[PDB]
Amino acid sequence: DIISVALKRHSTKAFDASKKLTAEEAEKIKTLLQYSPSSTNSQPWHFIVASTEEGKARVAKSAAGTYVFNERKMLDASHVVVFCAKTAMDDAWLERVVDQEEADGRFNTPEAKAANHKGRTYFADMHRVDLKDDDQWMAKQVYLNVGNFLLGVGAMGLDAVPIEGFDAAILDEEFGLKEKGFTSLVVVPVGHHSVEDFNATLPKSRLPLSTIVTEC
Amino acid sequence: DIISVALKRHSTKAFDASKKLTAEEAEKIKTLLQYSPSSTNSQPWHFIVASTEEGKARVAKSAAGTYVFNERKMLDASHVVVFCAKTAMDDAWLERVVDQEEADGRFNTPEAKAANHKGRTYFADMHRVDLKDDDQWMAKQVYLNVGNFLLGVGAMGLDAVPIEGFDAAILDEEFGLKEKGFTSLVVVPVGHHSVEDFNATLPKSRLPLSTIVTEC
Ligand SMILES: Cc1cc2nc3c(=O)[nH]c(=O)nc-3n(C[C@H](O)[C@H](O)[C@H](O)COP(=O)(O)O)c2cc1C
Ligand SMILES: Cc1cc2nc3c(=O)[nH]c(=O)nc-3n(C[C@H](O)[C@H](O)[C@H](O)COP(=O)(O)O)c2cc1C
* A36–chain B Cβ distance below 8 A for any pair: yes
User: Does residue B145 have its Cβ closer than 6 Å to ligand 2?
Assistant: no
Alpha-carbon distances of A176 from A71, A165, A187, B118, rounded to whole Å: 20, 20, 16, 34
Chain-centroid distance of CA A33 in Å reads 7
Task: Please tell me the distance from the alpha carbon of residue B214 to that of residue B216, in angstroms, as a whole number.
Answer: 7
A155-164 residues labelled b (16+ CB within 10 A) or e (exposed): bbebbbbbbb
**Residue length, chain A?**
216
Q: For residue B160, what is the enclosing H or E element?
A: strand B159-160
Helix or strand (DSSP H, E) at B128: none
H or E stretch including B86?
strand B79-86
Q: Which of B206, B213, B207 is nearest to A46 (CA)?
A: B213
B47 and A214: CB-CB below 8 Å?
Answer: yes
CA distance A82 to A100: 24
Question: For this structure, is A140 an active site residue?
Answer: no
Q: Does the beta-carbon distance from A43 to B206 stay under 8 Å?
A: yes
Ligand located closest to B204 CA: 2
Q: How many CA atoms, within 13 angstroms, populate the side-chain half-sphere of residue A9?
A: 27
Q: Is B165 touching ligand 2 by the criterion CB < 6 Å?
A: yes
Which residues, at least 6 apart from A32, have a Cβ–Cβ distance to it below 8 Å? A148, A149, A152, A153, B2, B3, B6
Q: Is B118 annotated as a binding residue?
A: no
Cβ atoms A79, A21 nearer than 8 A:
yes
Strand B79-86 to strand B182-191: parallel, antiparallel, or no bridges (unpaired)? Answer: antiparallel
| Of the candidates A76, A6, A82, A93, the residue with the CA atom closest to the CA atom of residue A41 | A93
Pocket residue to mutate for ligand 1, from A163, A197, A199, most atoms within 8 A of Cβ: A163
**Which residue among B31, B39, B143 places its CB closest to the CB of A144?**
B143
- Is A181 an 8 Å CB contact of chain B? no
Q: How remote is the CA of residue B121 from the centroid of ligand 2, in Å? A: 35
Q: Is ligand 1 within 6 A of the CB of residue A161?
A: yes
Amino acid in position A167: D
Catalytic residue among A25, A56, A71, A73: A73
**Chain B within 8 Å of A200 (Cβ-Cβ)?**
no
> How far is ligand 2, taken at its centre, from the CA of residue A130, in Å?
21
Contact A6, B152 (CB under 8 A): yes
A175 φ/ψ angles, rounded to the nearest 5 degrees: -110, 15
For residue A160, what are the β-bridge partners?
A11, A190
B156 CB within 6 A, ligand 1: no
User: How far is A106 from chain B, CA to nearest CA, in Å?
Assistant: 6
Method: X-ray
What's the full length of chain B, in residues?
216
Query: In this complex, do B148 and A150 lie within 8 Å of one another by their Cβ atoms?
Result: yes
Inter-chain residue contact B207 with A105, CB threshold 8 Å = no
Resolution of the experimental model, in Å, one decimal? 1.9
Helix (H) or strand (E) holding A211, with range, is helix A209-212
Across A101-113, b (16+ Cβ under 10 Å) vs e yields: bbeeebbeeeeeb
Q: Which domains does chain B have, with CATH numbers?
A: 1-216 (3.40.109.10)
Q: Is the CB of B161 under 6 A from ligand 2?
A: yes
The angle at the Cα of B12, spanning B16 to B203, to the nearest 5 degrees, equals 130
What φ, ψ does residue B151 adopt, rounded to 5°? -70, -35
The Å distance, Cα B39 to ligand 1 centre, comes to 5
B88 close to A (CB below 8 A): no
Residue B64 is given by DSSP the state -
Collapsing DSSP states into helix, strand and coil, what is residue B37? coil
Closest-CA residue of B relative to A50 is B216
